[PDB]
Structures are given as structure tokens and as C-alpha cells.
């Protein structure tokens, strides 16, 4: 009996794909999908050096818990990890990492997809492009 986990973290730390992927591994699970959001070096024609992120905590936390819970109402997932970085995210470093594990692959891919979409639509977080 392995408890299902929803691991949610907002943090100024640099995010690790390996760290986060390990938080969702399960001997009962054959599939892990991950989404990693990274700062692009440009936006609408101007060059970008960094994004800056802020959030309404703890509401953003609660809203992600709701996403976790809705995901488990449809899809047979085991573990969900959602890691969002706050403040300054320079180019090519990760602002978000979402991971989901399940027994089969459709669940993990679809739940990751619903998670990132729903996060962008519902979770009180905001970015400011910092230009050259």
C-alpha cells in the first residue's frame, strides 16, 4: 500500500527535472509524463534576458490542489508533482515542472496536458518579460 501523493511547491530555487521526476516514480507505474516550461530569449520581436514571476500564495497552492483533485476524478494517476519557480527565471532555466505517473500512458500524458492548461487559465501567477 503506497499512498498517492500530490507534491506542490512554489520556490525561488532552481528546479530540477531529475528531482521532480523522482518524486513521482512508483513501482506500480509504467509511465511518467513531464512538462517543463522554460524562459525563451525573445517575445513579440524583442530580445528577452529573464522572466520574473510572482504569485498569490497560498491561493495558487490551493488552486493547484484543486487541479490535482480534478485530475484524480477523471484519470487513474498515482502521483502528481507541480513545481513552480518564483522571481527571476533567466533564459533556458525552468519556470515550471509538472510530472504525473500512472500505470498506462494516456492518463499521464492527458493529465499533464490538463494540468499545464488549467494552471495557465486558473492559477494566480503572473510573469513580466525583462528585455534588453
Amino acid at each position: 500500500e503506497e499512498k498517492s501523493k500530490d507534491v506542490i511547491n512554489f520556490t525561488a530555487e532552481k528546479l530540477s527535472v531529475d528531482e521532480v521526476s523522482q518524486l513521482v516514480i512508483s513501482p506500480l507505474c509504467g509511465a511518467i509524463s513531464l512538462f517543463v516550461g522554460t524562459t525563451r530569449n525573445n517575445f513579440e520581436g524583442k530580445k528577452v534576458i529573464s522572466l520574473e514571476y510572482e504569485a498569490y500564495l497560498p491561493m495558487a497552492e490551493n488552486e493547484v490542489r484543486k487541479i490535482c483533485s480534478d485530475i484524480r476524478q477523471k484519470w487513474p494517476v498515482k502521483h502528481i508533482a507541480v513545481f513552480h519557480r518564483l522571481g527571476l527565471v533567466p533564459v533556458s532555466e525552468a519556470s515550471i515542472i509538472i510530472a504525473v505517473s500512472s500505470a498506462h500512458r494516456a492518463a499521464s500524458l492527458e493529465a499533464v496536458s490538463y494540468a499545464i492548461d488549467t494552471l495557465k487559465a486558473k492559477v494566480p501567477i503572473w510573469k513580466k518579460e525583462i528585455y534588453e
Binding site: 516550461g37 491561493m59 513552480h84 515550471i96 494566480p124 501567477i125
Partner: protein, 84 residues
């Protein structure tokens, strides 16, 4: 009650402050509450059409919704969001 208004993203740039406390009746409709906030930082008039509230961390649309606010409740001014 005395409530805490939180200003996020653009809305903090305009008001010029992350938060403040203001006084509001116990019962107030959400539009009436926005009007109080707008009154208090008229720059916010510009974005009156692209903002939502969170009251006690739950979304509230600016209309006839009747709010029953308790002391210390949080009213967040939520410009259009951009996570991930």
C-alpha cells in the same frame, strides 16, 4: 469590517502599492466593492474590464454577487493571469 486589499502584477504598478487595509460594510455587492477600490486609486479605471477578485482565496466576478466580509478577509485584485 477592516479588510486587506492585495494588488498583483500591473494593478500594483498603477495603485503603487502591494497591499492596504480599508473598511467596508458587512454586506456589499462586488461591483460596489470594486467602485470603492477604483475611487481610491483612479488609475485602476483603465483595467476595470480585465480584472477579477479573489475573496478569501476564491474567485468572484465583479457583479451583483453579495459579499459578506469578515475582519481580515483578503480581497485580491487579479489582473489577467500568466503562469507557467
Amino acid at each position: 469590517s477592516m479588510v486587506e486589499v492585495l494588488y498583483f502584477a500591473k494593478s500594483a504598478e498603477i495603485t503603487g502599492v502591494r497591499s492596504e487595509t480599508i473598511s467596508v460594510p458587512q454586506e456589499i455587492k462586488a461591483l460596489q466593492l470594486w467602485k470603492e477600490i477604483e475611487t481610491r486609486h483612479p488609475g485602476l479605471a483603465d483595467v476595470r474590464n480585465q480584472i477579477i477578485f479573489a475573496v478569501r482565496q476564491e474567485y468572484v466576478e465583479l457583479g451583483d454577487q453579495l459579499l459578506v466580509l469578515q475582519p481580515g478577509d483578503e480581497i485580491a485584485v487579479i489582473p489577467p493571469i500568466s503562469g507557467g
